[PDB]
Amino acid sequence: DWGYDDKNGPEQWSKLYPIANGNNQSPVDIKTSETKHDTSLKPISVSYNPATAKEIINVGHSFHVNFEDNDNRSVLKGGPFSDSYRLFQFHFHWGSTNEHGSEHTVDGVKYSAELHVAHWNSAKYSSLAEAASKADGLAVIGVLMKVGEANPKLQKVLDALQAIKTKGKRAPFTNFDPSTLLPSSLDFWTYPGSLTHPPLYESVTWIICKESISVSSEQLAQFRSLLSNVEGDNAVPMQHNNRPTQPLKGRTVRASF
Numbered sequence: 001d002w003g004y005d006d007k008n009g010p011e012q013w014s015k016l017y018p019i020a021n022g023n024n025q026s027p028v029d030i031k032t033s034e035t036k037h038d039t040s041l042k043p044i045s046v047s048y049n050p051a052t053a054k055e056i057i058n059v060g061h062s063f064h065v066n067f068e069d070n071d072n073r074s075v076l077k078g079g080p081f082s083d084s085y086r087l088f089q090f091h092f093h094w095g096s097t098n099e100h101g102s103e104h105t106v107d108g109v110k111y112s113a114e115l116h117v118a119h120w121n122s123a124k125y126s127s128l129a130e131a132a133s134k135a136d137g138l139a140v141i142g143v144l145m146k147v148g149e150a151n152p153k154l155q156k157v158l159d160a161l162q163a164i165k166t167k168g169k170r171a172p173f174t175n176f177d178p179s180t181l182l183p184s185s186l187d188f189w190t191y192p193g194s195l196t197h198p199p200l201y202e203s204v205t206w207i208i209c210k211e212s213i214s215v216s217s218e219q220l221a222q223f224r225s226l227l228s229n230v231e232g233d234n235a236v237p238m239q240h241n242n243r244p245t246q247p248l249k250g251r252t253v254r255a256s257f
């Protein structure tokens, strides 16, 4: 059993998951002076079908918005990829205070939250479960969220949280295109990395947007208002779910810009 508290947190994870001290761990600090511009990086092409939106679920440490992933209605293309990747999910990470909460940092700068839009390699693999542990199995768009103005595009997501307040609760969440949450510029960093929580597989090609999106201090409070406990128990708010940045270990972060 793992979490983000004292006993079961990021510093304890290695005890059950030795890959935590691996060579391709995420998130990282992106140092802009150390990034290598790569001229082969194509533009990011996302093409998502609103009808693939399926369900929202309170997973105890976080919440997920899952998508139907049986066909190629919702796909990521371009960037560092030859393979088309299929959308299956988006979720957020946040912190105890506005001062932190993002997973990735840029030149030491911590943002207030981070949006992850995750995809799996359906050109190569037959399922998420197969893809999940493969070097080229996963592609995740990471978007830094900067505290400021309320983000109207977050609304439907925020409004759905009242129906999944406690652990294990789930509800339909339909007719939503998560490319509406993405920044208007898709300029990006890319590097080979991992899932940022157990099982911490080194299967993720990260796409980190240069441009941030907004979130208000109140919108952040709604995330932290979600409960980690099951219905009927003592209310335990999901205060934070961000992993500390990890050693780059010789990896190079490429820039598309």
Ligand SMILES: COc1ccccc1NC(=O)Nc1cc(S(N)(=O)=O)ccc1O
Residues within 6 Å of the ligand: 089, 116, 118, 132, 140, 194, 195, 196, 197, 198, 199
């Ligand atoms: C393949 O995923 C998984 C496979 C098996 C068990 C848990 C997860 N993972 C999860 O519950 N969240 C999750 C986390 C990220 S992340 N934060 O690294 O971008 C990306 C996609 C994910 O679905």
Ligand SMILES: [Zn+2]
Residues within 6 Å of the ligand: 091, 092, 093, 116, 196
């Ligand atoms: Zn994530």
